[PDB]
């Protein structure tokens, strides 16, 4: 079926409003950025707060958050269900 985590072009502040209401750590969504057209953002809840990450793209067209590169957003999301998205906190993605 369709992915549960793709929310299209929603404002940053609306993504924080929606995620704040979730109760589990790791609840997340991918959105199309309004400040940087053509880029995607990953918004995730952890520890009563919401953090935003930019999905980076390199010179081969691959997507990544830090070092490990992926050929699709779907592969980057599923890798981060079991490897943290943060370097200082353990934040594993969980669908809303």
């Amino acid at each position: 079926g369709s992915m549960a985590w793709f929310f299209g072009k929603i404002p940053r502040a609306k993504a924080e409003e929606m995620l704040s209401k979730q109760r589990h750590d790791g609840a997340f969504l991918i959105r199309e950025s309004e400040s940087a057209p053509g880029d995607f953002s990953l918004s995730v809840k952890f520890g009563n707060d919401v953090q935003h990450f930019k999905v980076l793209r390199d010179g081969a067209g691959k997507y990544f958050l830090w070092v490990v590169k992926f050929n699709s957003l779907n592969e980057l999301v599923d890798y981060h269900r079991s490897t943290s998205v943060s370097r200082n906190q353990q934040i594993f993605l969980r669908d809303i």
């Binding site: 940053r12 990450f53 930019k54 830090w66 943060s86």
Partner: peptide, 9 residues
């Protein structure tokens, strides 16, 4: 441009 955890300012 706002900030992102993985984009160092």
């Amino acid at each position: 441009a706002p900030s992102y955890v993985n984009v160092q300012n």
